[PDB]
Design a protein around this ligand. Structure first.
Ligand SMILES: CC(=O)N[C@@H]1[C@@H](O)[C@@H](O)[C@@H](CO)O[C@@H]1O
Ligand SMILES: CC(=O)N[C@@H]1[C@@H](O)[C@@H](O)[C@@H](CO)O[C@@H]1O
Ligand SMILES: CC(=O)N[C@@H]1[C@@H](O)[C@@H](O)[C@@H](CO)O[C@@H]1O
Ligand SMILES: CC(=O)N[C@@H]1[C@@H](O)[C@@H](O)[C@@H](CO)O[C@@H]1O
Ligand SMILES: [Ca+2]
Ligand SMILES: [Ca+2]
Ligand SMILES: [Ca+2]
Ligand SMILES: [Ca+2]
Ligand SMILES: [Mn+2]
Ligand SMILES: [Mn+2]
Ligand SMILES: [Mn+2]
Ligand SMILES: [Mn+2]
Lengths: 229, 229, 229, 229
């Protein structure tokens, strides 16, 4: 069996165990700023991602086993205007050599691709439900399951995600401690059919393709563990 | 700082680190059977509880600190008839010398008392919402917050509960892996005002006070951790 | 499988997860003071012990399994005179209802009894090697294996103890960080034959039976984990 | 603070979280075979290394903090002849882009270089003590501290290594469970002066430069954790 875990209570400004992609950087104060901010204001057309350095072994063809994992993190999405926001932030798993894919509504994750994501989606695209939502996405920008999400501007959101290999159940929840409000969604997801044996895990985010649809996507901490047995 | 954690993938038939109260017992196969079963059928008027042996330090008056904790477990509630069920199962915290309190709708936890509970309530009492529900209860059988719960007869439910001391946020969720359906509720709870400095943690359950309102309340596993710093 | 672990970076002055026996107490500053101190000076004829509250499951007759465990702690033994010292401090495992046994050279552990101990023995009794020593003791005050120990008056000692069930190997080591000096001893120990299925773990210590053979026995921290599978 | 840990109870034959260097490979049965074996016999002039994929943050110049870490593993060194053996196996820390250095007595680690190692040295070079030894090495093939080591041909050795940042104490021990025999050495080591802020950790080994001084260097498992706070 092979267990792997890590925790950051904040991020190091030059983080060698984190692969930063696109616009992503860590601030002096240790926030993982996925999308660009200039003079303290979020900018449009931005895409950033961050992956943990070590690959994770999520299934093994030889032994026919699948990993179980769990992760928590908290994040903030702040927009200068509440009524126009885009595009969102996601936690994801993809092949180890994964690179940024399409910006805007594609969240840096998908395009016209093996990636499973839990998305916190702030803009209704042609493929989306009408309301902001938390979605579970398997190799598509279209979610197989979602829950309507009452996004709170600038408030810290706490997230817990777990995957139980014995039942193929992926569950994601979000809670705003400021008003004790929570949301949850689950799905049956076969990681062996969706992903390769080894993946990297992390975050992706994009700001809108227009000046009036901008927001930040900052991650404040992160813990992860996975066991393959 | 003082960290305490434990995990059981199943329970030992004579469990010395578990204080069994009322009707509670562990089966030969390692299930924690909180309420009585006779010839394989659940019996009425039953009350059982189970506490971890070691007290947990949840706050300290001298240093003014409060613990954060998290717990997962899975459980089954099976009734011979889906339309009449009672009374439910709870995870709870109470003083270390806690003893069983009122049966039936009081869940073994409350009466006409310092106890904080997350309840999985299968019968609408005079104090309850109309539907089955998951409730967060602070020193009362009346929940301060609840979510409507679509109870699935005989299916395994997975539970995750966390408490973040820095925000006083208690969150509880339930997922049925069989159909990837989930529920979540949160509340702001001040553990210093509700509970003493040291508590014991565990489970309580009760079957109905009538022959036609019976069900099992079995816990299949359990993991817990708490940190005070 | 059933995992249990705990860590204290210091001890609480009124510790509910620690069963204090004999003279043992926790100081205002959070040291576990096993033997008596009066006006800051150690007193003779003292015996103190401390056990973690939860029993540990070290073997199971039904499944024929044995636990593996590991523990670290640091401690200080300070004597007003380096040349006359007694009697020592031990880490031990015993039945859950274990009570203090003979004082002086018997270390609170043995007498004229199921207890396995790793002893840090500061006085040569009729049954001891000539020099101060670290011993592994199985149901006897006579050690089955020992290593000569250059005790450093008043210096912090770091201890690591592990037990590998697959090989029945118990190993104990001590290091003084002040001068990077270390000692180690191991033994083959069958826990099933020496101990019952469930035990409590902790510390015992005794000061000499004469006024000129006194010392402190203080534990500064402690971490423990055990897994039965 | 930032915690990182991993455990392997055996190694995967194509291990993506392990960077294999030189001759190192993982066998079908999951052993990490650092030096070459042909027809089941060890070959001369071999050098292999293995590093965990994620860099470890061992100190931070900005916050002036240093990590504490601990690691266990077990290994086998088997020679066809007990009286002529070379060269040995080591656990080490080096910059993330570390590459194999000199073969033979240099253990793949050093040359005519920032690397700190705990070495299990089976051949007395001009720079070595006369007997086989366990050494602590800071930027040199010459050990600053060592203990004489009674190497047991083909027996499993269990190793525990810890580093306490608060005292700068590095300690390494080895135990053979087959005959309950153990060895320990410690040293004061300043990781900030010896190493860069970020390192990779792992193993290196070399077989002798002559046909009559060959042995295997196989690692059977591995666990590691480090915390920077
Ligand atoms: C297809 C696509 O990326 N569409 C984007 C959408 O995601 C959002 O960024 C919007 C903001 O005005 O701009 C475009 O419509
Ligand atoms: C007050 C109280 O415990 N009421 C109980 C209720 O909880 C449930 O057990 C019911 C089943 O017929 O019987 C009584 O009404
Ligand atoms: C048998 C026994 O406990 N002997 C004790 C010995 O352990 C030590 O305390 C000594 C100090 O003067 O006093 C007695 O000899
Ligand atoms: C300097 C150097 O690597 N010396 C090596 C020594 O380490 C060992 O491999 C020996 C075996 O015959 O061969 C050479 O002497
Ligand atoms: Ca969208
Ligand atoms: Ca009710
Ligand atoms: Ca003695
Ligand atoms: Ca050598
Ligand atoms: Mn969407
Ligand atoms: Mn209710
Ligand atoms: Mn002795
Ligand atoms: Mn050497």
């Amino acid at each position: 069996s092979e267990v792997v875990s890590f925790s950051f209570t904040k991020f190091n400004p030059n983080p060698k165990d984190i692969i930063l992609q696109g616009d992503a950087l860590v601030t002096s104060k240790g926030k993982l700023q996925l999308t660009k901010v200039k003079d303290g204001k979020p900018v449009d057309h931005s895409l950033g991602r961050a992956l943990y350095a070590a690959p994770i072994h999520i299934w093994d063809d030889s032994t026919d086993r699948v990993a179980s994992f769990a992760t928590s993190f908290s994040f903030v999405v702040e927009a200068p205007d509440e009524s126009k926001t885009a595009d969102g932030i996601a936690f994801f798993l993809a092949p180890p050599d994964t690179q940024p894919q399409k910006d805007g509504g594609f969240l840096g994750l998908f395009n016209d691709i093996q990636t499973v994501a839990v998305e916190f989606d702030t803009f209704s695209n042609t493929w989306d439900p009408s309301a902001r939502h938390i979605g579970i996405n398997v190799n598509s920008i279209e979610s197989m399951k979602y829950v309507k999400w009452g996004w709170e501007n600038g408030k810290v959101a706490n997230v817990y995600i777990s995957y139980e290999a014995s039942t193929k159940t992926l569950t994601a929840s979000l809670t705003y401690p400021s008003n004790a409000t929570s949301y949850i969604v689950s799905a049956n997801v076969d990681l062996k059919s969706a992903l390769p044996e080894w993946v990297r895990v992390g975050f992706s985010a994009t700001s809108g393709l227009s000046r009036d649809h901008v927001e930040t996507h900052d991650v404040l901490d992160w813990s992860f563990t996975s066991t393959l047995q």
